[PDB]
């Protein structure tokens, strides 16, 4: 039967035009009071997942 | 493209022959047989005969060296299986519309 889109990945991640995989930096969900502003700010960006980890996530998204 | 190439291949060999009509063939094998001899088909070479004339297909079908088809049925396995291609103009007409 056809493959299913993994909804947890669909909800965390985006495949960019050239097929990199992009996600939010981890670590500002909470426990933030003593984090510097450099930290909070930088954790506010997206990052490009390491190739082996991205290639795996990509196969979970067969129809994006 | 396949259809067209197959007909093209027989054409390039001289083995494709177009005909206006079929003399006296009115549904009898010996009638087609006569006409054939006269048309250069001694039966030493297998023939894919394509025509909408039912009366002509019945006359020829039983001959071991003849495969018959309506023009809507022209297909490459049959062209490639046989040594010579023989067509009605009316047949040749539909084939031209199909490869368009």
């Amino acid at each position: 039967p056809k493959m299913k889109t993994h909804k947890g990945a669909k909800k965390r991640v985006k495949i960019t035009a050239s097929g990199k995989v992009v996600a939010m930096k981890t670590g500002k969900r909470h426990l933030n009071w003593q984090k510097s502003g450099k930290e909070i700010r930088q954790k506010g960006r997206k990052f490009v997942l390491a190739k082996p980890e991205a290639e795996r996530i990509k196969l979970l998204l067969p129809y994006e | 493209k396949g259809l067209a190439m197959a007909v093209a291949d027989r054409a390039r060999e001289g083995k494709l022959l177009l005909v206006e009509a079929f003399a006296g063939v009115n549904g009898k094998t010996k009638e087609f047989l006569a006409w054939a001899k006269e048309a250069g088909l001694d039966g030493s070479e297998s023939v894919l005969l394509v025509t909408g004339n039912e009366l002509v297909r019945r006359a020829a079908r039983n001959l071991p060296w003849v495969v018959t088809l309506a023009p809507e049925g022209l297909n490459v396995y049959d062209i490639v299986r046989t040594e010579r291609l023989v067509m009605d103009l009316d047949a040749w007409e539909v084939f031209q519309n199909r490869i368009g």
Partner: protein
Amino acid sequence: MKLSDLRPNPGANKRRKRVGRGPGSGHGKTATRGHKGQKSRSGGLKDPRRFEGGRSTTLMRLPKRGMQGQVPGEIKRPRYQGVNLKDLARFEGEVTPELLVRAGLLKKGYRLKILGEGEAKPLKVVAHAFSKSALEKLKAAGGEPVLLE
């Protein structure tokens, strides 16, 4: 050209790999599976795209983001597809959404928005939207922007 002559081009039809058929093949006994463990077993491993041996997975440690939607689902709103000026080059006279659908440029169910990559051509282009630069290039090349609503 006869039946005995019909061949696939080299490489067009490759042989399959057969395992577990003898030593000379170099794929006998273990059938290229190595020795023992889960992956050698019939049924094999867990989905290697996700599973990581029991530790929290790479994917599941990344944060979710944005609106995921709620029952009763997607909210119906007009959707726009852009098609650039350069794609309009091929037409002469008029362009309308319907035409662009036919040519295979605009997908059905999307409204038309014209965009600015390329040069404008003095055509009457009818559409639901224009970008700033599309409007400019078109007005400048003497073409006629018509807005649908």
